[PDB]
Ligand binder design. Structure first.
Ligand SMILES: *[C@H]1C(C#N)=C(O)[C@@H](C)[C@@H]2CCc3c(nn(C)c3-c3cccnc3)[C@@]12C
Ligand SMILES: *[C@H]1C(C#N)=C(O)[C@@H](C)[C@@H]2CCc3c(nn(C)c3-c3cccnc3)[C@@]12C
Lengths: 121, 121
């Protein structure tokens, strides 16, 4: 007989740690430079393999690097990265469209579907 | 008002992709050399930030590198890495103790508790 076991919460817990690591800027191997049209330049350190696992666009991009990002607002990028590491996203209603546009841009389909479904209303 | 959304399955899905990436040997930044006492040398490519998020011992170790691993059996290491990326682990009963010893060695407490609870019986 062969024993087997699954920890139901493991993925949620491992992501918690991965988020700590990003916040401590530990083990990061990418820096996203978001320069965008009158808004101040922002930088976001992250882990390539985590970004790739949430976005086909990031996966395509990566399969210490500094990446220039045009065409998306830093605050929008910030929220998408948070989603990549936390499985949740928040914005103030008067902006759920801007977020959606970022999520469309990065093929984060679950976020797109969420904003879209909410915007319809 | 501020909108918020959580994708319940995101962590399970992102890990699925991270596992694909490891299997395709994409974005890896560590190679674990497991040489152990009469057994053949084995190598395991992985992502530091994923190993770190499942093991305090790996986190301590990392906070393309080749790491020499002594004192643990390659097949045991293999199963622990699988657990790190899949949240599940399997072995053939006549070996759940060997696995437990590896899991103890790497402070993967949920695996230790699982084998321990099963061994008691
Ligand atoms: C509006 C908002 C709210 N409420 C947010 O929660 C965040 C997510 C938005 C970031 C992007 C943004 C916002 N307000 N504006 C006017 C923009 C913007 C500006 C220029 C180009 N694209 C977007 C926020 C702050
Ligand atoms: C026994 C086993 C079963 N059934 C497994 O599923 C895997 C996880 C074991 C790997 C380690 C191992 C096993 N059998 N032996 C004798 C060892 C071993 C040998 C020497 C030192 N430590 C462990 C497996 C194959």
């Amino acid at each position: 007989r062969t024993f087997s076991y699954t920890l139901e919460d493991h993925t949620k817990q491992a992501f918690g740690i991965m988020n700590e690591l990003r916040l401590s800027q530990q083990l990061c191997d990418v820096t996203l430079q978001v320069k965008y049209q009158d808004a101040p330049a922002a930088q976001f350190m992250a882990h390539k393999v985590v970004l790739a696992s949430s976005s086909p666009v990031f996966k395509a991009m990566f399969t210490m690097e500094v990446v220039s990002i045009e065409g998306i607002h830093p605050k929008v990028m910030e929220r998408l990265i948070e989603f990549a590491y936390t499985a949740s996203i928040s914005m103030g209603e008067k902006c759920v469209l801007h977020v959606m546009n970022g999520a469309v841009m990065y093929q984060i389909d679950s976020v797109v579907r969420a904003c879209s479904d909410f915007l319809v209303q």
